[PDB]
Tab-separated table of N, CA and C in Angstrom:
chain	number	residue	atom	x	y	z
M	1	UNK	N	-2.191	4.162	0.872
M	1	UNK	CA	-2.707	3.635	-0.086
M	1	UNK	C	-2.869	3.344	-1.307
M	2	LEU	N	-1.759	3.157	-1.675
M	2	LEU	CA	-0.982	2.936	-2.650
M	2	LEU	C	-1.048	0.681	-3.445
M	3	UNK	N	-0.612	0.405	-1.863
M	3	UNK	CA	-0.241	-1.382	-2.142
M	3	UNK	C	0.828	-1.599	-2.620
M	4	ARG	N	-0.572	-2.672	0.290
M	4	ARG	CA	0.231	-2.866	1.579
M	4	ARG	C	1.416	-3.618	2.205
M	5	UNK	N	2.777	-3.173	1.143
M	5	UNK	CA	3.219	-3.721	1.204
M	5	UNK	C	4.450	-1.279	1.157
M	6	UNK	N	3.746	-0.466	0.952
M	6	UNK	CA	3.383	0.115	1.740
M	6	UNK	C	4.697	1.617	1.386
M	7	UNK	N	0.408	4.317	3.220
M	7	UNK	CA	-0.671	5.312	2.085
M	7	UNK	C	-1.418	4.816	1.186
């Protein structure tokens, strides 16, 4: 949930 480079 932060940004797909990774929740």
